[PDB]
Amino acid sequence: ATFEIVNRCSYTVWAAASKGDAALDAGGRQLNSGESWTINVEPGTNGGKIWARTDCYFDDSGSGICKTGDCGGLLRCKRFGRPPTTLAEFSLNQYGKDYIDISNIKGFNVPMNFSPTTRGCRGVRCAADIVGQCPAKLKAPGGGCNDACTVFQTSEYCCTTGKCGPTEYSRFFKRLCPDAFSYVLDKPTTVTCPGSSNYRVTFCPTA
Ligand SMILES: [Cl-]
């Protein structure tokens, strides 16, 4: 499966791609404003995620730090990134179908469109100005808008017991981006695509 990752933001992002215990493709790369990076993701990849990282520095060896989405200080991510990170999430070739979503469960940093480039399903988008409108208590000083679980570490926000409801904080994310997951037990906004579809993740899809 191919994912074209496109940075339409006016600022540089460092794209990242991981399934939590391994990189997808090279795992990460710099994308200046306007750049595209096409990656190959192995069929059957379950629980894959793509995200943007902002304000990164890396040495010649690919070690450093990012202000949002840092993955253990690596340019080439092997693990998931530090919140806040808008997430493009996907599981591929699951009994003949692909499943895609956008999630704000680990906060929001950069707006995103996540769309198939092949036939048979729709895309999803979270392009509202979540950082600008972020509730005071969720604003990350390093940049971005944290989820409430990251900030407050309660069973209700983290849905630790498997029982949780929507919250004032989850409703904020849901208000701004109805088509993205706002908390663990949100009514799903997962799209079912044909098995072996291809995709494009666009950062800052709209002005
Ligand atoms: Cl900020």
From Swiss-Prot:
Primary location class: cytoplasm
Q: List the disulfide bonds.
A: 9-204, 56-66, 71-77, 121-193, 126-177, 134-145, 149-158, 159-164
Q: Which subcellular locations apply to this protein?
A: Cytoplasmic vesicle
Looking up Gene3D superfamilies in the UniProt record yields:
Thaumatin
**InterPro entries (UniProt xref):** Osmotin/thaumatin-like_sf (IPR037176), Thaumatin (IPR001938), Thaumatin_CS (IPR017949)
What keywords are annotated for this sequence in UniProt? Answer: Cytoplasmic vesicle, Disulfide bond, Signal, Taste-modifying protein
**UniProt-listed Pfam families:** Thaumatin
- Say yes or no: keyword Transcription regulation present: no
Q: Which domain of life is it from?
A: Eukaryota
Entry GO CC: cytoplasmic vesicle
The record's function comment reads:
Taste-modifying protein; intensely sweet-tasting. It is 100000 times sweeter than sucrose on a molar basis.
Family assignment from sequence similarity: Belongs to the thaumatin family.
Give the protein name, as stated in the record.
Answer: Thaumatin I
Q: Which organism is it from?
A: Thaumatococcus daniellii
